[PDB]
Amino acid sequence: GYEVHHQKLVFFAGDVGSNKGAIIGLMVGGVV
Amino acid sequence: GYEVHHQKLVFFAGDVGSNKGAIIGLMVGGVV
Amino acid sequence: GYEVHHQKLVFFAGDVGSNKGAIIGLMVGGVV
Amino acid sequence: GYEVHHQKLVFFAGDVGSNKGAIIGLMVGGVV
Amino acid sequence: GYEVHHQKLVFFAGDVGSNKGAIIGLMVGGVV
Amino acid sequence: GYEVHHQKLVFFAGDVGSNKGAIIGLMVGGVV
Amino acid sequence: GYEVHHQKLVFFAGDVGSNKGAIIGLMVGGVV
Amino acid sequence: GYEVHHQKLVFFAGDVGSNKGAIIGLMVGGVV
Amino acid sequence: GYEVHHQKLVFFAGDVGSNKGAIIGLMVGGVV
Amino acid sequence: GYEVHHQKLVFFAGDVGSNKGAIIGLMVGGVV
Known part of the structure; x- marks a missing residue:
């Protein structure tokens, strides 16, 4: 049984x- | 059994x- | 059994x- | 049993x- | 049993x- | 004058x- | 004058x- | 004058x- | 004059x- | 004049x- 949720990456x-x-x-x- | 949900990437x-x-x-x- | 939902990418x-x-x-x- | 949730990376x-x-x-x- | 949550990286x-x-x-x- | 070339992403x-x-x-x- | 070249990302x-x-x-x- | 080249990321x-x-x-x- | 080259990240x-x-x-x- | 080269990160x-x-x-x- 595997329960993975509510990950995020902003x-x-x-x-x-x-x-x-x-x-x-x-x-x-590169040059900014 | 696998339960994966509610991942996001913004x-x-x-x-x-x-x-x-x-x-x-x-x-x-590249140049900005 | 697999349950995957509510992923998003903005x-x-x-x-x-x-x-x-x-x-x-x-x-x-490229050049901006 | 695995329960992983609410990770984030900002x-x-x-x-x-x-x-x-x-x-x-x-x-x-590169050059800033 | 594994319970991992509420990690973050800002x-x-x-x-x-x-x-x-x-x-x-x-x-x-690179040069700043 | 801007010269940008030979970038690649593999x-x-x-x-x-x-x-x-x-x-x-x-x-x-998702599950692999 | 800007000269940027030969960047790569593998x-x-x-x-x-x-x-x-x-x-x-x-x-x-997700689960691997 | 800017000369940037030969960067890479593997x-x-x-x-x-x-x-x-x-x-x-x-x-x-997630679980590996 | 700026000369930056041959950086890498493996x-x-x-x-x-x-x-x-x-x-x-x-x-x-997450769990390994 | 700036000369930066041959940096690496493995x-x-x-x-x-x-x-x-x-x-x-x-x-x-997380758990290893």
Whole structure:
């Protein structure tokens, strides 16, 4: 018997005002 | 017997005002 | 017996005002 | 018998005003 | 019998005003 | 001036003999 | 001037014989 | 002037014989 | 002038014979 | 002028025979 529930994975749980930059989850190299 | 439920995966659970930038989940290289 | 339900995958669960930028799920290279 | 529940993984649980920089989860190299 | 619950992993549980820098979870090399 | 090239993203760069299991890129929940 | 190149992201760079198990990149919950 | 190159991210750079278990990159909860 | 190169991130650089267990990069909770 | 190169991050640089246990990079809670 296996009971698995209610897992979650959020990257950004909130509110942003005036995002002029970068919100990136996974980057390899590159220039921001 | 297997019971799996209520998993979730969100990247951005929230509200944005005036997004002038970048909201990226997975980038490889490149310039923001 | 297998019981799997109520999984979900959202990228952007919220509201945006004046999106002048980029909202990208998965990019490989390239210039924003 | 296995009972696993209510795990979570957030990167950013909060609110940002005027994000002019970078919010990156996992970077390899590159210039910010 | 196994009972595991309510684990969590946050990187940034708080609010930022005027982020002009970098908030990075895991970097290998590179220039900030 | 922007010069971005030669990015790549592979999940499985190799050879498999007698795959009787599962090779999955991104799963949410469920039983293997 | 921006010069970004030759980034890569592999999950499995190699060879497998007789895969009877699971090779998963990103799982949320669930039973293997 | 920005010069970024030759970044890489591998999870499994090698060979496996008789994989009867699990090779998982990122799991949240669940039973192996 | 910025010169960044040859960064890498491997989790498993080697060979496995008869993997009957678990090779997991990042787990939150759960039973192995 | 910035010159950064040849950084690396490995978790397991070697070979395993008969892995019947667990090889985990980062766990929060849970039972092995």
